[PDB]
């Protein structure tokens, strides 16, 4: 069916004329890609784009031992 071989490539080239993502999204693709974009961040964490690690650690304080001896 090479007449069908040409007819699924030629209506693939029409999909390669794109402006803003989906062609017939409407309220469908706008809600779904925003529902999924939250879920990759919801149970994952709150993370910005480029912020480095900012913290500070304190070690164990070295106490002394009192000892009258001999």
């Amino acid at each position: 069916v090479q007449k069908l071989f040409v007819d699924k490539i030629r209506e693939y080239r029409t999909k390669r004329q794109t402006s803003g993502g989906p062609v017939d999204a409407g309220p469908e693709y706008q809600q779904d890609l925003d529902r999924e974009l939250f879920k990759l961040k919801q149970m994952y964490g709150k993370a910005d784009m480029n912020t480095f690690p900012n913290f500070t650690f304190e070690d164990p304080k070295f106490e002394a031992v009192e000892k009258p001896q001999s």
Binding site: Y44, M49, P53, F57, D59, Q69, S70
Partner: protein, 52 residues
Amino acid sequence: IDLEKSQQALVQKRHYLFDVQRNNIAMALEVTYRERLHRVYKEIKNRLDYHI
């Protein structure tokens, strides 16, 4: 003999507690060293992991 050897073996017990103190604080300071590096090593992947 015992009262001489009571002070003899005591000062070998006094120096044991200073070998143990000198390596414990040297190591407990060192355990926080790479753990400071680990969390920055952790965080530089997580901002990469969120984008990919």
